[PDB]
């Protein structure tokens, strides 16, 4: 079931995986929820895409380490020990910003490992207690694309700061 740890993890990947390849290994199928799911990080994406202040800091981190720098910011927006899914989706995309700049290649299968590994160890406990990945489908039905691109652009820019 979706909460089942096993499934949040293979549900992450293929979520994970297809908005990489949207910004910029075979996809293996998916469900009805997860294609869900799959449109509207590609919706907040394009949105995020737009959002200059954003795009200015994330132009700003000079990154001889990806995995240095990504595990900074993956750390700094969970340091206060709480959860929301909105620092989720500025994890997934700032993964994706990683990915985009190793477009100079086998970093997309390198990113995604970070990311899996930073979601099961520090994440997972808090997603089951969301139900699973629906509560990400809650959290896109509450509100709207530019709403909620306004919280995941700023939970993603203070973390992008302090670095």
């Given at each position: 079931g979706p909460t089942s740890s096993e499934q949040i993890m293979k549900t992450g990947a293929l979520l994970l995986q297809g908005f990489i390849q949207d910004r910029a290994l075979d996809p293996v199928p998916q469900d009805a929820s997860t294609k869900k799911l799959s449109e509207s990080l590609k919706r907040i994406g394009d949105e995020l895409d737009s959002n200059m202040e954003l795009q200015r800091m994330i132009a700003a981190?000079?990154?001889?380490?990806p995995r240095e720098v990504f595990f900074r910011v993956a750390a700094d927006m969970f340091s206060d020990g709480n959860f929301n899914w909105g620092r989720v989706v500025a994890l997934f995309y700032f993964a994706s910003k990683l990915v985009l700049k190793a477009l100079?290649?086998?970093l997309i299968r390198t990113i995604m490992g970070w990311t899996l590994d930073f979601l099961r160890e520090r994440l997972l406990g808090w997603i089951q207690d969301q139900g699973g990945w629906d509560g990400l489908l809650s959290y896109f039905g509450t509100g709207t694309w530019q709403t909620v691109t306004i919280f995941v652009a700023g939970v993603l820019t203070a973390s992008l700061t302090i670095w």
């Open positions: 981190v000079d990154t001889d380490s100079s290649p086998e």
